[PDB]
Ligand SMILES: *[C@@](O)(CO)[C@H](C[C@@H]1CCNC1=O)NC(=O)[C@H](CC(C)C)NC(=O)c1cc2c(OC)cccc2[nH]1
């Protein structure tokens with residue numbers, strides 16, 4: 001099952017940022033509030049021009065009942081760093097990280113500064129996420145929690161015409177070739193996260209369906225050559241080592257699981273299922289499998 | 293997408309309760325801590341509790357230690373009275389959920405919340421959770437408005453991998469007892485009303501391939517439902533699906549005729565809202581939210 005991290009430490013940081021009539025979500029850490037810079041906008045806007053035309057007083061920042069006053073502002077990439085007169089008493093230990101494709105994080109969906117729901121998603125190889133984001137969701141945040149430290153890694157900005165979502169890290173650099181404009185943008189073709197599909201296949205073996213296994217063998221090179229022809233990410237030697245624990249628990253060598261996957265890619269499943277589905281799941285990490 | 297409620301108001305109520313070498317998670321509301329009674333541990337729990345002093349309960353809220361002032365047992369739960377009243381307790385109710393309804397689980401270990409996720413009370417009164425060793429005392433809830441409705445406390449994993457537990461009054465969901473016994477639930481069924489709500493959800497998102505021009509009656513639908521291990525559908529169920537009927541413009545018995553086709557013919561490798569299976573853990577209330 002897809003589990004999310006507990007959202008509490010992040011709920012205390014969610015605020016509402018309003019400019020004129022356009023409102024979105026912001027992240028209040030210490031005396032600074034972060035939010036997508038498009039709060040000040042629509043096609044091909046000059047963001048420097050519009051920021052210099054804006055006064056601190058223009059930004060309405062509400063944190064629950066309280067109103068916070070912008071004591072200053074600056075732009076970092078596609079984000080705005082509003083300085084506020086109050087430090088957030090509920091700020092957690094935190095860091096900004098750049099999540100990598102294949103990896104997962106939890107999204108705390110927010111509307112009007114109120115956290116609505118938390119779900120877990122992965123960053124795809126084409127630098128989009130298959131999220132659930134309605135109008136009002138910009139500035140909602142993705143994050144991982146290790147110990148008591150929160151790793152902020154995603155701020156929501158856009159939904160591509162194809163249903164998927166695009167955003168930035170906490171420094172405002174967009175993941176992927178997207179720009180914050182009211183234009184239709186296309187992601188690159190979405191390749192499948194091989195490392196996670198193998199983790200799934202290992203998970204299926206621990207659950208007791210082995211029907212897709214075989215005695216054929218493969219080298220890493222030859223598996224990667226097949227995989228790319230089916231739009232699957234090549235498997236690095238690093239990924240092989242990551243699968244080590246799942247390999248020893250099941251007694252099935254990683255290259256033999258790849259030989260299995262190679263046969264699934266080339267012949268499909270004759271309507272057969274793994275863990276109940278006809279399609280191979282690719283947002284369960286090896287860590288997720290090991291933990292559960 | 294399954295979405296869990298923000299777990300913040302619950303995480304501040306999670307504490308650790310230890311009796312000897314036995315540890316589990318507890319729920320700290322006001323001045324009382326709720327936790328599965330087997331923390332004191334087929335025995336007799338009335339005998340075990342009388343031999344227990346308040347001093348023997350190690351209750352910890354994070355770094356802090358709480359002193360048990362008194363206690364009492366209600367069903368399968370302990371009500372530990374403590375000297376401190378939790379400053380973080382939200383507005384809350386205890387409710388008993390009905391099968392088919394959904395909630396969020398804050399999975400906890402050694403008093404530390406580690407994960408949140410959605411799940412549903414199955415018709416056989418189990419839940420398909422994700423619980424590991426140390427997870428008893430983990431709590432299920434709904435956070436509608438600012439009021440938290442606690443509805444589940446975790447107690448066990450059956451041989452089949454599903455989970456079982458009680459309400460916050462300590463009465464089990466289902467036939468189970470808190471003993472170290474292998475126990476069996478009844479045969480499960482598929483939550484028909486939830487499957488239909490999810491079909492309405494797909495239409496709203498534009499997946500309409502499974503629709504058709506036919507209609508069915510309630511009685512004819514249930515003839516097909518019974519054969520495929522779905523719960524019978526009732527007129528109460530149809531009235532619940534009213535608002536989604538209106539939003540999509542598809543009559544509730546039109547959607548049933550679409551579902552009978554999906555059951556009879558199956559889905560030919562095609563997918564509804566991403567999955568290759570008919571999802572039954574999204575309720576009509578869920579889809580509105
Ligand atoms: C934020 O809420 C906006 O502050 C919003 C979130 C999306 C709305 C629906 N689901 C979401 O995830 N973001 C946008 O509306 C952004 C705003 C930009 C960055 C200025 N724009 C889009 O996501 C967008 C624009 C267009 C488009 O043009 C018009 C054509 C096709 C798709 C598309 N997406």
Ligand SMILES: *[C@@](O)(CO)[C@H](C[C@@H]1CCNC1=O)NC(=O)[C@H](CC(C)C)NC(=O)c1cc2c(OC)cccc2[nH]1
Nearest residue numbers: 330423424425426427428447448449470471472473474
């Ligand atoms: C709590 O953590 C208990 O301290 C624990 C949670 C489960 C452990 C693994 N995953 C869980 O969800 N609960 C138990 O161990 C309970 C304790 C009872 C209520 C006294 N027991 C079981 O879940 C249990 C016992 C047996 C069994 O016996 C023999 C045989 C088969 C399954 C089984 N489950």
